[PDB]
Design a protein around this ligand. Sequence first.
Ligand code: HEM
Ligand SMILES: *[C@@H]1O[C@H](CO)[C@@H](O)[C@H](O)[C@H]1NC(C)=O
Ligand SMILES: *[C@@H]1O[C@H](CO)[C@@H](O)[C@H](O)[C@H]1NC(C)=O
Ligand SMILES: *[C@@H]1O[C@H](CO)[C@@H](O)[C@H](O)[C@H]1NC(C)=O
Ligand SMILES: *[C@@H]1O[C@H](CO)[C@@H](O)[C@H](O)[C@@H]1O
Ligand SMILES: [Ca+2]
Ligand SMILES: [Cl-]
Ligand code: NA
Length: 511
Amino acid sequence: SQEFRSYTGEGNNKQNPKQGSIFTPFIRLANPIKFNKNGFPNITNQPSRAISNIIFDQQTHIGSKEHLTDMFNMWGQFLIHNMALSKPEPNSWPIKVPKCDQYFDPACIGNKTMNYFRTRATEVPCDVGKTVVDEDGKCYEQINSLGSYIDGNVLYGNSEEICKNLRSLSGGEMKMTVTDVGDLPPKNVPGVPMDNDANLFPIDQLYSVGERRGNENPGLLSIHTLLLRDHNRLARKFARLHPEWDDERVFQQSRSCIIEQIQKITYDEYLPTTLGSFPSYTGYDANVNAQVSNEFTTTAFRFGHSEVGPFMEYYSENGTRLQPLPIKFSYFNPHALNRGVEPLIRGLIINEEENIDIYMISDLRNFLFGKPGQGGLDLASRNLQRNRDHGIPPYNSLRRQLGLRPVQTWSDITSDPQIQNRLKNAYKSVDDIDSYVGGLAEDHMEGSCVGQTFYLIIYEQFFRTRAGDRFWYETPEMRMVNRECETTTFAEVIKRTTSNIGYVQPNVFRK
Ligand code: HEM
Ligand SMILES: *[C@@H]1O[C@H](CO)[C@@H](O)[C@H](O)[C@H]1NC(C)=O
Ligand SMILES: *[C@@H]1O[C@H](CO)[C@@H](O)[C@H](O)[C@H]1NC(C)=O
Ligand SMILES: *[C@@H]1O[C@H](CO)[C@@H](O)[C@H](O)[C@H]1NC(C)=O
Ligand SMILES: *[C@@H]1O[C@H](CO)[C@@H](O)[C@H](O)[C@@H]1O
Ligand SMILES: [Ca+2]
Ligand SMILES: [Cl-]
Ligand code: NA
């Protein structure tokens, strides 16, 4: 009776069963400032949408200075969906639109807003860890509505019941939609609630995968598809190798391989690209907590929104460039896979992404439901709100609490005058800068695509989600379990799972 991971994350740490499990408070690297959970946070800086217009506005293409690909940030978005979800409660703190905003209030009605709901929170002890006494006299911490471990929840769901509805229960395989253009994920699966944020298409047309927001964009769904194909491929092998294994055993052995495949790409390919390198595994530490930190998911790792390019490229088998799909048209759009995943994959690995800086494309920052005065969303604003919702300390306060030296003037953050000016325009002091905008404004660390601050927060998180993981693939007991897997590089998984994909570079995150 071999022991396999749970679907929720609990049981991973023997001494602290719930450690890292779903629906548990986030960790803090730095004390939060009072965020007044039950009301609005007391913010003296400019509102989120103002900071968005002043700092994040983008009018031209910059292009990744590190020469990274769209596939790189598709994995980043795929990676975070394995780790953290800040699920909101019906606790409304709307985003105020400045009067006369050309994108959300051209008629100059100064009461226009964008929907925002504060993250689920729970009362915590005031004399434990890094918290703060809220303005109502109690201490609160935000709740991670997802397992903190990299455990394939993106494919298999967050519980037994959801998992056994996504899988065929035959040969240990996952349900799939067989089509004229390869195998695609399933649809209309009972018990698998899928997100429809943009609400362009009816939910019965969305694909049913282990992660609610899997339909967010097609490039994300494509990654889901290939790892599902690779899963059913391994299940057929284990079925032939071990005919005595029932459906449950073939599935788990296949699930175990895919989890290892996800982990290996992250720590052998993704992180060395993000941070320039990464130390080698040093063994499981039962005293390390793998739980996600509030600053990691809220602040540091949200850099990807800066790097998303405006267009999604499509290429055919013979290498011809097809009509690019603009991001704004791809939000929760299953039609993007009508011609299979191969045309997307080709575009993702060849097309260079956007630079990680203060600028965010307008597909994300100025997305509209229709006319310029009725509805829409601003991802830059949502991030600022979330940081202020969670009580992320100011830029210089965070650095101090991370063991870094605080900045003294604007030039200490960057030499680019236009960045300096936009910071002067948005904030009157460096000690008023939001950690999110400050870390983005920093110069990239040597060999990295992020600044010193974000570098430190990201490095600190992924050290723990590896060291604190009892089922980490590099541990002796897990090399034994996964002795018949076929874990390779991401580029080779693509070839294994695609039809006539064409040329694929070894590192699909670069060039
Ligand atoms: C649409 C969105 C994306 C691309 C078209 C996109 C992309 C990324 C990348 C590439 C990331 C990291 C490398 C990344 C990180 C995180 N995102 Fe995320 N993202 C899109 C849309 C959203 C939306 C909407 C949210 C929630 C907005 C809000 O906070 O109100 C979002 C969140 C995050 C996030 C926080 C994780 C969490 O706890 O939910 C990241 C670390 N992304 N995105
Ligand atoms: C808001 O913060 C300012 C200082 O940042 C403080 O003077 C003021 O009293 C605070 N307001 C509330 C309602 O807490
Ligand atoms: C905002 O509230 C309603 C929105 O329907 C609007 O009629 C009203 O004029 C606005 N309030 C102002 C402008 O003070
Ligand atoms: C093959 O290449 C030609 C050349 O432009 C292109 O028009 C056609 O769509 C391609 N068809 C494929 C790859 O099936
Ligand atoms: C915070 O605390 C309770 C414990 O009583 C949790 O069950 C729940 O998540 C709430 O939001
Ligand atoms: Ca950018
Ligand atoms: Cl500098
Ligand atoms: Na997880």
